[PDB]
């Protein structure tokens, strides 16, 4: 089966959404946070939006890349602008 | 959505954009995702696809540098998007 890349790029975000999610309202949910984390290390990122990235930074920084302070998270991009970077080959750098 | 459905579905992507890379005509943007994803998830090609991987390893779009245990031990890109859906990191 062929694989489009404005699907794919939308099924990530939307899994990503469900870990985020999960990893905020609930502690203890030890596999979301774990992905959440993987993915935040990994793309360099906070949350869906700027908001979100700033709140869980403030809010749950364990959840944010080490070394993240709170102020960049306003200014960087969202793990759904990394996530369309991925696919298109923009460049997450 | 399905994290074993939607792991098969970004490696299939991958591999899509590969086999496309290895191609020098009008692949810029095939060649622009493979070495993001090389970049990205630290890996280069795939076990599963031996003869791909080494030409795009020729085309040097699995540049070194950092980590030079890395560039002489190459990461597999499945195994990397598997890490990335399961949370293993
Ligand atoms: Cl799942
Ligand atoms: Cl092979
Ligand atoms: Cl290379």
Do not use: M, R, W
Not at 5 to 30: G, H, P, R, S, T
Not at 36 to 54: N, R
Not at 66 to 73: D, K, L, Q, T
């Amino acid at each position: 089966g062929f694989v489009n890349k404005d699907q794919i790029a939308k099924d990530v975000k939307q899994f990503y959404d469900q870990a985020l999610q999960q990893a905020v309202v609930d502690d203890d949910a030890n596999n979301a946070k774990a992905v959440v984390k993987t993915f935040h290390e990994t793309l360099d990122c906070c949350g869906s939006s700027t908001l979100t990235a700033l709140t869980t930074s403030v809010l749950k920084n364990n959840l944010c890349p080490s070394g993240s302070n709170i102020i960049s998270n306003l200014f960087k991009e969202d793990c759904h602008q990394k996530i369309d970077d991925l696919f298109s080959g923009k460049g997450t750098k």
